[PDB]
Amino acid sequence: VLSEGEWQLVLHVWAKVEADVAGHGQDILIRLFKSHPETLEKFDRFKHLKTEAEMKASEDLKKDGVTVLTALGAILKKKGHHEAELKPLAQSHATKHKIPIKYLEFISEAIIHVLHSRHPGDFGADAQGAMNKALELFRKDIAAKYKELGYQG
Numbered sequence: 001v002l003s004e005g006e007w008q009l010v011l012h013v014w015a016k017v018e019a020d021v022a023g024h025g026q027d028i029l030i031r032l033f034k035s036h037p038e039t040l041e042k043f044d045r046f047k048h049l050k051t052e053a054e055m056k057a058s059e060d061l062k063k064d065g066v067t068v069l070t071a072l073g074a075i076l077k078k079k080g081h082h083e084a085e086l087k088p089l090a091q092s093h094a095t096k097h098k099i100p101i102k103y104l105e106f107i108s109e110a111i112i113h114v115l116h117s118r119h120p121g122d123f124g125a126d127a128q129g130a131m132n133k134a135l136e137l138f139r140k141d142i143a144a145k146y147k148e149l150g151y152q153g
């Protein structure tokens with residue numbers, strides 16, 4: 001459970017993300033693939049791309065970054081009350097995409113990196129800690145749902 005003030009810090013920086021969801025999503029996915037190249041293997045559509053410029057030119061990558069951030073933003077706006085939003089996400093990510101929790105850690109690291117790089121004045125230590133807690137809660141709850149579906153990832 002985050003405090004109300006922590007949730008407000010999370011949602012304050014998230015509004016900045018919403019000014020350019022697609023550019024933030026591109027930077028986050030590219031950071032994820034640069035830091036953890038194995039994750040790129042999960043995206044059949046563009047797993048063959050080799051340079052940063054190719055990744056920035058990929059319409060599929062840009063669309064997927066929007067998909068991820070749109071879903072995550074809706075989750076964050078629930079302020080922890082996100083069982084109904086997590087249910088379909090756990091279903092697909094446990095049974096079809098097979099995304100282990102460690103990969104959700106990797107993408108959390110990429111999110112924090114991009115938010116700090118782009119919005120340092122709105123992402124100091126207390127806001128970073130709030131976002132860390134919110135992403136940890138997301139990962140904890142989706143791991144529990146993973147197990148309910150038989151996936152130990």
Ligand code: HEM
Binds near residue numbers: 099
């Ligand atoms: C904040 C974490 C994430 C969120 C909110 C998120 C959300 C979504 C959503 C809403 C979709 C489309 C609907 C669905 O299939 O459920 C999707 C698809 C997908 N996600 Fe995730 N995702 C996250 C993390 C990841 C990570 C870390 C990976 C891989 C390392 C991944 C791999 C995929 C793949 C492969 C698809 C299907 C792409 C396609 O076939 O078009 N996701 N994600």
